[PDB]
C-alpha cells in the first residue's frame, strides 16, 4: 500500500525500489500574445527516477519536441512518464529490475499500472510523504543538462556523490531530502549556504560540494534554520 | 399460457414471479402459478419468512419443459423439478385449476415491463452463465459468487459472467496504453462484441440478466457485472448508434423497476455520475438521465 512515516525504513532494505517523480516532466512559461491573449511555451523537462538505497538517479530528459502537435499535455505527460519508466525497467537486467515503484503523485498510479501490466510482480505504490523532488531542477548540474538537451536523452547520475562511503543510505536520503526541501523553500538562501565558502568545491564528477563530516553537520543545521526561518516569514511566527 | 404447479407450501414464504410477489402462509393451500406468458424467460423466487437470509430462485422458460416446485424438508428449500410425464402433468394442473388453488400471473395488458427487462435474455445464455447442465432451469441465490470474484471458492456454484477488467492485458493493446485506457472502444467493439459476445444482443442479454440477479437476489457480483458492462459502453468514444439508443431504453426500464428503497445498495454513485455526466456518452442516454434525475437526484 502507501509509503509513509510508519514504514520509512523499508526504503533502505535490500529489495530494489525506485521513486518516480513527474513534477518536472511538462514545464511551461506562460506569456502574453501580440493580441493580448495568453499562451504557453514548453521548455525541456525530466523524469526523476531515483533508487533511494544506492543514490542511482535515472534522469530521462523530456525534450519539447515530444509535445509537438499533441493535446491535453498535462495528461499526456503522466502517460509519457509511465511509458519511459516502463521502457527503463525493460532495459534493465532482470536482477536489476525493481520490486516496487513508488510514485510521488497519485495521478501517476493508473498510467504506470497500465504500462507495467507485463510486470505483475512489480508493485506500484503511492506515498503519503511530501517529498521535495521537484527541487531537483535547483541542482545546477541537473538543470544544465536538461536545458541544453537538443533531443531525448537519459543521463545517469548518483545523487549522493560519494556520501555512502561514510554514511548509511538512511542518513544520505535524509540529507538529500533536507537539501531539496531547503532549495524548494528558499532557493537563493539555500544556494548561498552551499557555496558561501569558496574553499569548498564541487568535484567535476559530483553534484554537491566536498564537505567534511563536520562541515556537513554545520550545513545541515543551516538548512534546518532556513526551513524554519522561511516558515516564520511565511506564517508570521 | 403456461403453469408452474406447487406440490404444497409447507413453510411460510414470500414467492416472487418476475416483478410480482405474494406471501404464502405456513401450510396454506397453495398449488402454483398459472397464466404465465409464453415467449419470455421467467424467474420464480423465494424468501423464507423465518430466515430472510438467502433469497433464491429459478430461471426457466416454459417452452422447454413442464416444471413444478416441491419443498424439500432435508435441504430446506423449494426446488424446481421437471416432470417428464406430460399426461401426469396436464392432469395435475387441470385439477389444481378446477379447485382454484393457483394464483394468476397478474399481467396488465398495457404493461411491457417484463419484456423490456428481458428483451435480450435467452435461456440458452443463462445456462452458460449458470452451469448445471442436467436441468433445463437455472438456480441462482444471493450468495453465489462470480468467476471474477473467485479470481480475487466452489467453481460449480459460480456465476460465469464474462470477465471485464479495465486494467488488464485483454483491455489494453501494447503500445496503445493511454489510448485504450482513456477510450475503451477497442475493448468494447473488438475484444468483447466481435470476439466474445459475437453481437450486441448477447452483450445486452448478459447485462440484463446481471441486473435482474442483482435486483431479485441482492447478488453483489451481479451488480458489479451490470455496472461494468454499462461503464464499458459509456467509456467508449465509438459505439454504434443503435446500441446507444437501445442501451438508453434498457437502463430506463431497469431504473424504473428498481425498488426505490434499494437504490442505496444497488446503484454505484461513481459509475452513474461518470456515465451520465463525464463519459463520452454523457449526452446519449436521454431517457435514462431524465428518470435518474427525477427518481434518484441524491445519488447524483
Ligand atoms: N542511474 C545509475 C545507475 C547505475 C549507476 C549510477 C551511478 O552511480 N553513476 C553512473 C554515472 O556516473 C557515475 C555514477 C547511476
Describe this structure in words.
With 237 residues, chain A is of the alpha/beta class. Chain A folds into two domains: 9-163, Nucleotidyltransferase, domain 5 (2-Layer Sandwich), CATH 3.30.420.230; 164-237, Up-down Bundle (Acyl-CoA Binding Protein). Chain A is built from six helices and eight strands. Chain A has helices at 73-91, 109-115, 140-148, 169-185, 187-195, 213-235; strands spanning 17-21, 27-32, 38-43, 45-50, 56-62, 100-103, 123-125, 153-158. Chain A has a six-stranded mixed beta sheet, sandwiched between helices. In chain A, strands 2-3 form a two-stranded antiparallel ribbon. In chain A, helix 4 packs across helix 5 (187-195) and helix 4 runs parallel beside helix 6. In chain B, 41% of the residues lie in helices and 17% in strands. The radius of gyration of chain B is 20 Å and the shape is elongated. In chain B, the strands form three sheets. A five-stranded antiparallel beta sheet of chain B has the order 3-2-5-6-10, covered by helices on one side. A three-stranded mixed beta sheet of chain B has the order 1-4-9, with helices on one face. In chain B, strands 7-8 form a two-stranded antiparallel sheet. The termini of chain B are far apart. Chain B is an alpha+beta fold. In chain B, a hairpin with a 4-residue loop joins strand 7 and strand 8 (77-83). Chain B has twelve helices and ten strands. The longest helix of chain B is centred in the C-terminal third of the chain and has 18 residues, at 200-217. Classes of the chains: A alpha/beta (237), B alpha+beta (300). The A-B interface holds A 76, 79, 82-83, 110-111, 113-115, 117-118 and B 167-169, 172, 177-178, 181. Bound molecules: (3-aminophenyl)(morpholin-4-yl)methanone (WAX). Residues 56-58, 156, 158 of chain A line the site of (3-aminophenyl)(morpholin-4-yl)methanone (WAX). The PDB classes it as splicing. The entry lists the keywords fragmax, fragmaxapp, fragment screening, RNaseH like domain, U5 SNRNP assembly, splicing.
Amino acid at each position: 500500500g502507501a509509503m509513509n512515516s510508519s514504514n520509512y525504513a523499508e526504503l533502505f532494505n535490500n529489495d530494489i525500489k525506485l521513486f518516480v517523480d513527474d513534477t518536472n516532466v511538462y514545464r511551461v512559461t506562460v506569456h502574453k500574445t501580440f493580441e493580448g491573449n495568453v499562451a504557453t511555451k514548453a521548455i525541456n523537462g525530466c523524469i526523476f527516477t531515483l533508487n533511494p538505497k544506492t543514490g542511482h538517479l535515472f534522469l530521462k530528459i523530456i525534450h519539447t519536441s515530444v509535445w509537438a502537435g499533441q493535446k491535453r499535455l498535462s495528461q499526456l505527460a503522466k502517460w509519457k512518464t509511465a511509458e519511459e519508466v516502463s521502457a527503463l525497467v525493460r532495459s534493465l537486467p532482470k536482477e536489476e529490475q525493481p520490486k516496487q515503484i513508488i510514485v510521488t503523485r497519485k495521478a501517476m498510479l493508473d498510467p504506470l499500472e497500465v504500462h507495467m501490466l507485463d510486470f505483475p510482480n512489480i508493485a506500484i505504490r503511492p506515498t503519503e510523504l511530501r517529498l521535495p523532488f521537484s527541487a531537483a531542477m535547483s541542482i545546477d548540474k541537473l538543470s544544465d543538462v536538461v536545458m541544453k538537451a537538443t533531443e531525448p536523452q537519459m543521463v545517469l547520475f548518483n545523487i549522493y556523490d560519494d556520501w555512502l562511503d561514510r554514511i548509511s543510505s538512511y542518513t544520505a536520503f535524509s540529507r538529500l531530502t533536507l537539501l531539496l526541501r531547503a532549495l524548494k523553500t528558499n532557493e537563493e538562501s539555500a544556494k548561498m549556504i552551499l557555496l558561501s565558502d569558496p574553499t569548498i568545491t564541487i568535484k567535476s564528477y559530483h553534484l554537491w560540494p566536498s564537505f567534511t563530516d563536520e562541515q556537513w553537520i554545520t550545513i545541515e543545521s543551516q538548512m534546518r534554520d532556513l526551513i524554519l526561518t522561511e516558515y516564520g516569514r511565511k506564517y508570521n511566527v | 399460457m403456461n403453469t408452474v404447479p406447487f406440490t404444497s407450501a409447507p413453510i411460510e414464504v414470500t414467492i416472487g414471479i418476475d416483478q410480482y410477489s405474494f406471501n404464502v402462509k405456513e401450510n396454506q393451500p397453495f398449488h402454483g402459478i398459472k397464466d404465465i406468458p409464453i415467449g419470455h424467460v421467467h424467474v420464480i423466487h423465494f424468501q423464507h419468512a423465518d430466515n430472510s437470509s438467502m433469497r433464491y430462485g429459478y430461471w426457466f422458460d416454459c417452452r422447454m419443459g413442464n416444471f413444478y416446485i416441491q419443498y424439500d424438508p432435508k435441504d430446506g428449500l423449494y426446488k424446481m423439478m421437471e416432470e417428464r410425464d406430460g399426461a401426469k402433468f396436464e392432469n395435475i394442473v387441470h385439477n389444481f385449476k378446477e379447485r382454484q388453488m393457483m394464483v394468476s400471473y397478474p399481467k396488465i395488458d398495457e404493461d411491457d415491463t417484463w419484456y423490456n427487462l428481458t428483451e435480450f435474455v435467452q435461456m440458452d445464455k443463462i445456462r452458460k452463465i449458470v452451469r448445471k447442465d442436467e436441468n433445463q432451469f437455472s438456480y441462482v441465490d444471493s450468495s453465489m459468487t462470480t468467476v471474477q470474484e473467485n479470481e480475487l471458492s466452489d467453481p460449480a456454484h459460480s456465476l460465469n459472467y464474462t470477465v471485464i477488467n479495465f486494467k488488464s492485458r485483454e483491455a489494453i493493446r501494447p503500445g496503445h496504453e493511454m489510448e485504450d485506457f482513456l477510450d475503451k472502444s477497442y475493448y468494447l467493439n473488438t475484444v468483447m462484441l466481435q470476439g466474445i459476445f459475437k453481437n450486441s444482443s448477447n452483450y445486452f442479454g448478459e447485462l440484463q440478466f446481471a441486473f435482474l440477479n442483482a435486483m431479485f437476489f441482492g447478488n453483489y457480483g451481479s451488480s458489479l457485472q451490470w455496472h461494468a458492462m454499462i461503464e464499458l459502453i459509456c467509456s467508449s468514444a465509438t459505439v454504434p448508434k443503435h446500441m446507444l439508443d437501445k442501451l438508453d431504453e434498457i437502463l430506463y426500464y431497469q431504473i424504473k423497476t428498481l425498488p426505490e428503497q434499494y437504490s442505496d445498495i444497488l446503484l454505484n454513485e461513481r459509475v452513474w455520475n461518470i456515465c451520465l455526466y463525464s463519459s463520452f456518452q454523457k449526452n446519449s442516454l436521454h431517457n435514462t438521465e431524465k428518470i435518474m434525475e427525477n427518481k434518484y437526484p441524491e445519488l447524483l
